[PDB]
Amino acid sequence: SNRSLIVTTILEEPYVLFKKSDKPLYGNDRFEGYCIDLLRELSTILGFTYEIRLVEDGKYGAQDDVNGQWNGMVRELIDHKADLAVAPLAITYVREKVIDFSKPFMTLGISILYRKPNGTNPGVFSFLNPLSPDIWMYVLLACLGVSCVLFVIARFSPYEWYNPHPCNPDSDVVENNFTLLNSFWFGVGALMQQGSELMPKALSTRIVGGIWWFFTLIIISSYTANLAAFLTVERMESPIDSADDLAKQTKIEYGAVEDGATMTFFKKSKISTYDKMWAFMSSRRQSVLVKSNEEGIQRVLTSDYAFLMESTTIEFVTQRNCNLTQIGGLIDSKGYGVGTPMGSPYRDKITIAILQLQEEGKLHMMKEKWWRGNGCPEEESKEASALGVQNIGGIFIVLAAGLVLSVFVAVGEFLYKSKKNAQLEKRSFCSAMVEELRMSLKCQRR
Amino acid sequence: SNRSLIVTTILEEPYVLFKKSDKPLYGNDRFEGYCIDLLRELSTILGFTYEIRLVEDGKYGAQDDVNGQWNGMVRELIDHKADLAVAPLAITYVREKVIDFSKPFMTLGISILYRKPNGTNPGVFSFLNPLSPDIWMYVLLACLGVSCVLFVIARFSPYEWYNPHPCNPDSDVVENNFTLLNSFWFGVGALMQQGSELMPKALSTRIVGGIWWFFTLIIISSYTANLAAFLTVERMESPIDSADDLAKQTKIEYGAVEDGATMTFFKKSKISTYDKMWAFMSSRRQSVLVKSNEEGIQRVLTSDYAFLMESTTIEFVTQRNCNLTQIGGLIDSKGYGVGTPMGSPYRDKITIAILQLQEEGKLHMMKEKWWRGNGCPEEESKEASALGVQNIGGIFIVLAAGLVLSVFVAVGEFLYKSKKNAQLEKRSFCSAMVEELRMSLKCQRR
Amino acid sequence: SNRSLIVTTILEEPYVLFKKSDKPLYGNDRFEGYCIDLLRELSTILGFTYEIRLVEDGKYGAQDDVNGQWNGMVRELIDHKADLAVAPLAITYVREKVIDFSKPFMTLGISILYRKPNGTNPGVFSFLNPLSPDIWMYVLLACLGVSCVLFVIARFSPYEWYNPHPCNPDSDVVENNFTLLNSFWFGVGALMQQGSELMPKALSTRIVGGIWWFFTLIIISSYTANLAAFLTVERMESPIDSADDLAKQTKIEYGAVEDGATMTFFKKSKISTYDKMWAFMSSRRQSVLVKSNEEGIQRVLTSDYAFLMESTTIEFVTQRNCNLTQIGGLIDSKGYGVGTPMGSPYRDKITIAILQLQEEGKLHMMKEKWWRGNGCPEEESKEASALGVQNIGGIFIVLAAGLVLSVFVAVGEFLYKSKKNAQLEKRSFCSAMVEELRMSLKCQRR
Amino acid sequence: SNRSLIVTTILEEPYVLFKKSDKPLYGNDRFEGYCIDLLRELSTILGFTYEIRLVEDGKYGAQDDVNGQWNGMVRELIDHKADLAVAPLAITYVREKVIDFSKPFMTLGISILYRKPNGTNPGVFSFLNPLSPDIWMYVLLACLGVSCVLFVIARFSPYEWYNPHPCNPDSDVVENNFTLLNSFWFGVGALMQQGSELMPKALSTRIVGGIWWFFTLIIISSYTANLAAFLTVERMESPIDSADDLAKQTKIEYGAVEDGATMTFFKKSKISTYDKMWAFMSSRRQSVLVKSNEEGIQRVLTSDYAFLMESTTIEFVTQRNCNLTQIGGLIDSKGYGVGTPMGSPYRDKITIAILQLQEEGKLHMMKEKWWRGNGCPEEESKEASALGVQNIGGIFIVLAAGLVLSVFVAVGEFLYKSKKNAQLEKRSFCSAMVEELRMSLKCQRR
């Protein structure tokens, strides 16, 4: 009970922050957080007393590189104007050459912030998904396949060659409804569940028409059922999944705090994925390198952007906001340790104490208390939105594309018939003008 | 007539009341309720005259650590001023160190108030939901757009002008089937999947019809698959059935009475489901922790609120309001017993007296007299997920709206023909008289 | 530490049973269960010692009614050849007139065993469920309604009266395809998504045919989508829900242990629901009154049967087996109390101790340890079975019913035409025999 | 050359090995692995000659309460026989009271082995699943049954025999369109929802066709709605993603190594999710608690088993077998550090040496050399729920089976006509030669 320990500590949520009460001027119950509850139960097992003191500089600790002078909390650890440094103070090779750390109470690393997938614009078509792109092409090869087979069988079968003119049938003239043009019009019209004016007689052609109807009915039933599975159970998917999946895409842009501890890892890196990721953000400096953590969260939240901070700050923000999520595992491995001056016997005593706190399972109980906030279980039994112009939206393009295609066929049939009239009339001009008159007669017969 | 014993209660209903009548100078006849009928039937089989005396404080009992003493009824019993605390005095641990109970007369626990689930509001025209109102208009404008294109293409195309009357070679006639009215009827018929009496015969008009068929195949499939998504996710909507269901729940807020025995249970609770319920309450103890029981009942009404109180006071106000419903079982387990001073010779005679009334079935009858009144019809079907008139409903209105509209057109077709029939022969009225009788020949031909 | 307490105890799972180990002959760690863990922590707070002793009779305790001699455990509580009776010993008015109980450590009551619903035979039709029985009748009234409206409009419209014989049309004869027979065949054929040979001209009749197609397309889309909601999310429902819902149905039969503590409640009852339930099982004695608990569980499991035992034994068996479930709440209210001789000071000390064990929340931790076994969470995302003959199964009846109905119409048309021939030929015999010859010509023309 | 320090390991791979070669009389060159490369690079930057010496016991270290002493490496360090326990010696609480660690060189935890999800076996002909094989046969027998009834009814009915050739009044002809072949083609066409070229005209045959239409409307709806149920519930099948997912899970059993640090964590655990995992293990500790790590790997293969061991030994054997997959994150948090005797002057020089290798990026490179080899292709698409050739598949086979069957019928129709054509004029072969050239006129008429 001699010389009560001066704990230096910086303010950062959820580690150490003030308590939301009016109730002024009492002190040392003024703070509340993760690094207060851990520090509380260190003096439960050990024996020491407080005066938690905020750092008078507002930094952690770094090099000045002009005189070697230190800053932050670890400047107070050297000249003994502090005793402990229970705070987010990561263990660093530069730091422990002048102070001493305890064994870590939290494990962390560099990870990725990115917006959670939304499903607002699934694609302008987005209806073509319940069948595979192989299957969408294999049914067009089935339509062109069956109709060529149905054309050959209808020509080489005797009972399809029937007697036309069902008004006075007594003759020798024999026609055939299945041309090549009429054979695709069967296979398209049977596919689209609509039927046609022509229906096969002559059982060899009815087996083709019978088995094409059963092929059709499974396709539309499989398309309707699988689309009913998509719209019921929305399973979203992110574009990115890891660092190498983000090291390739150029549309997303990277991001870290300028002159932070995260970009120092990418500058000093040698791994071929992260050497590419630094060459991105070194050339694009003053565009993707933000100057603070809270400003970098906004650029994920406003623009299309990814952010590289520590994993513990990601695990705190993604429990608060539901816009955001974590992408991939951990890149680096670092640890928060209790700062301690050189030679002090309180290093090994807290080192024993943290392992005592861990085997009982209290740090997991501390972490679940301060990082779990309101919680985001918002994914449930998805509230069904109607199909909109962003959802189906693309059958209106292919409808307009078919109508524009058909006008060019209509002019192509307007000229091919007039060229056939040009075999019986003059060159190009008079046969086309008389043909335009028949629509300007505006009548029904002739 | 040994001592004319003095018995203390607290004015809580249904337990004790004032007998609602005029004409004062009552004795112990001014009281009624559950504990008055319990005190009566305990007096008949044990032989003692009771004099009812309300406690001066009005509190049940608790230790104030200022004086280390009790208040209310348990202070009235330790001072030997009155025995027989026949009241809602719950048997808890700290209250039996001071006084002696009997065995309980009312099984009890902590449960959850919540509002009875109102509505779900399916409404008329709820079939119109799986497509947005932009889509229902755009499909309607597509059917009035494609049929205006197919009218123009089939008029300009030469190959649509074919030879009718399938006799009489080449017949000096040509004919266009696709008029203006016949082209809307193609587009409407293809929209409702049932093909019309006429199909295109030229490749220009078979691309318009062929791409309108693919448009309508997606529209009917997207309507059916989304309606299979709306009806599935509202079949998976389960209401709140337990306190564990409230654990993940965030929108509907919890509640308790301030410094009552209910929130006292949550402070001492080691259950992780119940400790998360206190993590809600220890933070936000200004908007959900309400002051009185009657205030929290009003909070369940005009909020999204779930109040936590004793099971008897839940199951009483659910009998008085059809807007409320107990959800969940019983969280705690406790019971009301009568109160006697420490070392009294009466708690054994009452325990045998209470068990005698339980074997006879009195306590189940003595509840229901003061418990249930004007039993609610409750509207309990709740398996009405079978698309009744409440669900689908509106397609019987628009069918009736279409059949009334068609009668107005049938009169308009009757007048327009009879006006043209009176253009040459008849004047105005005798044309309409012979035409109404023309259609009343009850025959098949002419 | 004088005269170590002789605890009498009967064997019943999960309260007290032997431990599954080979390891013979050590004693008093030999037993393990609920009433061992509670009894363990009674001697943690109090001070006393064991020799747990099994009862030498294998009963709880009852009357002989020929000499008043007791049996079971409570026979040993009277003559002091026991000290405690930590066991499932329910508090009874007959029992406490000779011994003393502590305050209860478990609350229980009479409840209902019954088989969990299965969904194996949902009904032989079972396809008629996604539309309400109002809606199934309202579409037949729509078919008969529209076709009568479509018949009247097609007669009273001029443009429907068109020129027949499209082979040489130059005449004055005018026919009409819409008869009364042909008008139902439109409305049936449009309902069944099949079309017909006849298609309306004359726009007033096309508005009827247009709006009937849109009515049809919503019905089949609503039927397919809601059936896709049933088969995805199976929501089972029991026939019975409470005692009064079981006091009405005769197909289920009741059940309790003969000369048990449960049927004594129904014999002595006065409530109008349970007086009816006793008149069932008093007249049907030796048929529904079983002689043991384990034999009564089998009759629920083999036959269609309900069983009336205590709620704690229901809460133990229904955690073991997934065939079984609990129906309704609790009928009676009883309690397990620690037996104690008269005047013994260990009654009030354990009474304080049980309330000490309860406020800390340990009996809930004891009960969740011994009643939760493997657990039955087996309801999940139901593994879809194909539609079988037990599932759809009833369209094969109405198909055969329609074909048998049509043969009687075919004979009715065979006679009505022959009666029309009988107006031109003789009475009944020769016109019917010549008409039978034309099918025996076995040809196609004439 | 100060002392030529002695360093103790344990033969566990990848950490230390034997260098696989012939030619004995090695020194410390007979070892290789992770901790040999760590000991090398710690020797280069700190300047000490190491002599590797395997520990005599082979155990890591634990207290036997018989003697209260340690064994294995931590006994080798307290006795000052050798320093530098460069080995998988995890930093735990009881091991640092005896010896001193450095700061960790490998982040570690407890995770879950589980077999990689094999198959899901969609197979060819999986479209045939939403109806049972009784139903696919009965619908086929219904189409061959109704069409045999409709052949008999339309032959016997007088009203079906109508006048063909719609000119020439009454024409001395009658005609039945419904032959045997034309009646199957009605029933097949109505089955596949696309109406044929002929419809019934009598009320007897319009009830057969009218009730066959209602039969097929239910069959196509029941096929589509069940297929929307199969494809939904296998889209809701999420694999096991956490230990909390194993908590409700019952079929796939847990596992651990006997008396290891993994099950030691579950005994001390106060987490209700992890305590339920020990409720599995404390009962069934003969079938799931296995003796060695290599035995439990074989249990994951040939069982439904989930083994619990350290995260490094999971992530090593998943690199060696493509049949295995780590599921879940990290349950525990712990780490390997090198071991030094209590109060050694080397643990500070090693901690700076370990942090120097972490800043350079050595420890991420020193893993991957001894960690990853022959990287697995992993078959990772896993969003193939879009009905590919694996899913639907088989309707392309039966379409191809129908088109090959129709060619055999077309030859049979060609021979049966040419045999009847050779019944009167030609003999056998020149009839077939002029008929093949009859169909090769490449025209539309004759």
Ligand SMILES: CCCCCCCC/C=C/CCCCCCCC(=O)O[C@@H](COC(=O)CCCCCCCCCCCCCCC)COP(=O)([O-])OCC[N+](C)(C)C
């Ligand atoms: C009467 C029936 C006669 C059928 C004869 C057909 C002619 C010959 C055609 C040959 C086609 C050759 C090209 C495709 C190759 C097929 C062979 C094959 O791959 O094996 C397939 C199985 O075999 C089947 O399942 C075939 C099913 C055909 C049924 C369709 C009949 C159409 C009737 C139309 C009626 C129209 C009615 C409507 C009009 C009124 C798939 O096998 P696998 O999975 O790859 O491996 C097998 C291993 N295993 C055995 C352990 C599982």
Ligand SMILES: CCCCCCCC/C=C/CCCCCCCC(=O)O[C@@H](COC(=O)CCCCCCCCCCCCCCC)COP(=O)([O-])OCC[N+](C)(C)C
């Ligand atoms: C161009 C359109 C002209 C329509 C005139 C129809 C004639 C007149 C017919 C009268 C029918 C009388 C009997 C039924 C009673 C209906 C009135 C009623 O109940 O109100 C309903 C609303 O009103 C509607 O929404 C009606 C919708 C009609 C649309 C159908 C047009 C058919 C076009 C055919 C084209 C075929 C094309 C195919 C062929 C080519 C329901 O209201 P509520 O819920 O009970 O309470 C209202 C309270 N609130 C206001 C706050 C919500």
Ligand SMILES: CCCCCCCC/C=C\CCCCCCCC(=O)O[C@@H](COC(=O)CCCCCCCCCCCCCCC)COP(=O)([O-])OCC[N+](C)(C)C
């Ligand atoms: C003659 C028979 C023809 C059969 C063709 C078979 C189909 C094969 C065709 C294409 C095969 C698939 C290839 C992939 C497409 C490439 C990308 C693409 O073009 O997408 C484009 C649309 O896509 C279309 O427009 C294609 C449809 C053309 C109309 C087909 C009509 C035929 C109807 C058959 C009738 C049968 C009658 C039978 C008569 C006997 C989208 O690109 P975008 O417009 O730039 O996006 C703008 C988005 N924005 C506005 C939001 C900015």
Ligand SMILES: *[C@@H]1O[C@H](CO)[C@@H](O[C@@H]2O[C@H](CO)[C@@H](O)[C@H](O)[C@H]2NC(C)=O)[C@H](O)[C@H]1NC(C)=O
């Ligand atoms: C069921 O009816 C009640 C009472 O009409 C609705 O309660 C309203 O709740 C809102 C939300 O707090 C209040 O602002 C209103 O004052 C309440 N009373 C009204 C509108 O009279 C309740 O919302 C209904 N249930 C549902 C699901 O809508």
Ligand SMILES: O=S1(=O)NCN(C2CC2)c2ccc(F)cc21
């Ligand atoms: O700064 S440390 O004490 N030493 C280095 N390491 C390792 C990456 C293995 C780690 C890994 C996780 C920590 F929490 C601490 C440390």
Ligand SMILES: O=S1(=O)NCN(C2CC2)c2ccc(F)cc21
């Ligand atoms: O205060 S008690 O007499 N003893 C403690 N408990 C129970 C644990 C069941 C209960 C439960 C219900 C009661 F009515 C009384 C009591």
Ligand SMILES: O=S1(=O)NCN(C2CC2)c2ccc(F)cc21
């Ligand atoms: O046998 S008791 O001690 N006294 C009577 N009752 C009551 C039904 C009120 C109850 C109710 C529940 C119990 F657990 C015990 C008893």
Ligand SMILES: O=S1(=O)NCN(C2CC2)c2ccc(F)cc21
């Ligand atoms: O044995 S330690 O040095 N101290 C305790 N823990 C932590 C819970 C953070 C960890 C976690 C990961 C490690 F690598 C080392 C340790």
